[PDB]
Design a protein around this ligand. Sequence first.
Ligand SMILES: *[C@@H]1O[C@H](CO)[C@@H](O[C@@H]2O[C@H](CO)[C@@H](O[C@@H]3O[C@H](CO)[C@@H](O)[C@H](O)[C@@H]3O)[C@H](O)[C@H]2NC(C)=O)[C@H](O)[C@H]1NC(C)=O
Ligand SMILES: O=C1O[C@H](CO)[C@@H](O)[C@H](O)[C@H]1O
Ligand SMILES: [Zn+2]
Length: 752
Amino acid sequence: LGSTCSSPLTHGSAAPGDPFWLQNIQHQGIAAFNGNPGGYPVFRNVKNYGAKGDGNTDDTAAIQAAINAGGRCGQGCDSTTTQPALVYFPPGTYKVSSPLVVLYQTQLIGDAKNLPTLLAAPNFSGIALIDADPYLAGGAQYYVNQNNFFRSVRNFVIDLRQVSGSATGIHWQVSQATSLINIVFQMSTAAGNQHQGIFMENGSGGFLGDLVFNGGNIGATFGNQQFTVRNLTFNNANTAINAIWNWGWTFQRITINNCQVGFDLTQGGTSNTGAQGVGAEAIIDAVVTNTQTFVRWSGASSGHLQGSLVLNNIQLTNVPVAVGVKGGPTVLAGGTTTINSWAQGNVYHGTNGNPTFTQGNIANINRPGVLLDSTGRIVSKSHPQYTGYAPSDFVSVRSQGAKGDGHTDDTQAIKNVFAKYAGCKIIFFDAGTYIVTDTIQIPAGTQIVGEVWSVIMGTGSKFTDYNNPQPVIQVGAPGSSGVVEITDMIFTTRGPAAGAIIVEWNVHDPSGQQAAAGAWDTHLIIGGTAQSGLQVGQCPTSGAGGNNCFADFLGLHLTSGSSAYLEGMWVWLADHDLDSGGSQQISLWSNGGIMSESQGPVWLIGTASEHHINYQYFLKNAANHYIGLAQTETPYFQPNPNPPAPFITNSNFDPSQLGQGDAWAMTVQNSHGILVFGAGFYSFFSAYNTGCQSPQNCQNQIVNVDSSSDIAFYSLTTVDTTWQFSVNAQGVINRSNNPNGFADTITAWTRN
Ligand SMILES: *[C@@H]1O[C@H](CO)[C@@H](O[C@@H]2O[C@H](CO)[C@@H](O[C@@H]3O[C@H](CO)[C@@H](O)[C@H](O)[C@@H]3O)[C@H](O)[C@H]2NC(C)=O)[C@H](O)[C@H]1NC(C)=O
Ligand SMILES: O=C1O[C@H](CO)[C@@H](O)[C@H](O)[C@H]1O
Ligand SMILES: [Zn+2]
């Protein structure tokens, strides 16, 4: 416990009529590498910019000034980490008449005690009320969709009910490090209405969750490579979810009430050169009441894989058809019953490479009990917002001497904040980049909250030696136990840093509090950013930067005694430079992404690990992990060089079987109770050349398990890899058995 208090802060001291803490907290954020750090406002209350919030004044332009202010990344800008914005909305109804354009690196945040309403005016015109990627003449857009990172919308009512024609709440054409949190969509239930909650046509996501859709023709149109979605509720919709295409997604905790169709799944072809539909859906813990068809496919499957589905723990009350083909036959009859485990697609057992095409119940999926809440469902825990906490329950790191200016060594000031306040106050990292040169231990008991772009950047000799790797952030002491919640933080390095273990996670849940230790909207954005030493000017794809371009030793280390509930975390070794303009590719060296030795419980919900040399995920003597969806990519420069280079073999942190030519997406040794429910593991290059994408042979193997591990894979999608699944570095499941569009999919694998 911190030295300023006698027992832990365990609840807020706000009076219920007080505005949400974020409005009145001192606003001290800096954009460190902005052209004008001293004049550039990070926080913007929409009312300070003229918003009335009275339902009659058109507030579109006032809100837009709150977004736009400071000269930010708009038309003609690829990406930015240096022009952040927290757009804050106090209670009110804000009438808008054209799209609010949510620029690169913007968070829209409503009062969380009293959700503000965004009210579409009856003459609303435009693609959606909130627009994350505007279209320009010629079908250009502000941003490349696969590059459209850093965006959040939290705590709104979105009310389309005054629009008599079509209306869309959010054009959410986004990729990783984005979330939608705590939003209610109010839509017409009139016959023939054309209301749509979300329109999403492409992207490379992503996490979103905790939304309620009331009414509408379509709750969400979703088209995107991959996404994890937690705790959405669809009431009185025509189609809850109109899924138009994907490689593979995971849906957890879905509720569909009084809808015509729940999931409307567009089926496509099986070749990488044909029409792309929905490759894979993995749905776990769904409740469905008074709905005609729970899941409908656009077309039938004739005895081979052509669109994959996994269902786990589906509770149906008055749902005639569980799975059916559009104007085709019923595939699984419903009624009032609980579906335990059911799949459509190719099911595999052991080291036998034989597909069993399945449209039927499958062996019951093991769900280790430690991973399940007290209603028996995968734990579901939303981003903590501290709604009943008052501003004085927070302590500001800027107020305690941490400069956040990206230059001053902030190690001591930060260390001191933890020593004085851990467990005493919520620790508020005002926006900024905080340079540290020694381990920052976050003690068990701590709650940490950032402000859109609050970065801890480790640098210097403690972190440069791969033979002696050292932690930049330590989450709890070894053996420790307690609440640790981290929200809106970035953990990174200033290169070179070949010895950086960016996050070492030790803390375990206390007895009887599940997911009390976890991170939300918290990422490891490794290189590719302003003044990181790891940009295109230091690290060209030629490899000319050499030993300067070591970015880290390991991104995230989950240790033996730890538990972690990790939601949306992107462990991104930068493939390209976000800040120099041009999205230029760069070659950076990370030895590995995520290594877990944790005995559990570990929930990894829509985490991604990308561009590390030896593996994106390594589970070594781990137990009791629920992983879904997990997304990877191999570093673009491989096989030049081959793993482990430019590192050397390390027997503590590397797998026994090193990747041959290319990194493992996931490699598992001596582990049990591991459930991977939804995976997208990709390989797009051979030494910067894309030629291997067409013949689908960019790398040879990508997923390894040993002989003994107790691990199960469901909806395992890989891209451009010959062997999709290996036991003891020998290919077992060949891609040629599972083509499913652009990507290839294993519906189920189990040892037996
Ligand atoms: C799934 O997401 C929804 C949408 O965010 C979550 O529902 C929300 O839950 C919060 C926290 O329990 C509710 O607030 C509570 O209100 C009661 C009185 O109404 C008060 O006694 C509490 O102190 C608390 O503030 C909130 O109303 C509710 N929001 C909506 C629109 O329903 C839900 O928690 C999520 N479920 C899971 C499993 O994550
Ligand atoms: O698909 C992607 O798009 C990006 C390429 O623009 C890359 O930065 C991400 O790491 C990758 O997931
Ligand atoms: Zn928060």
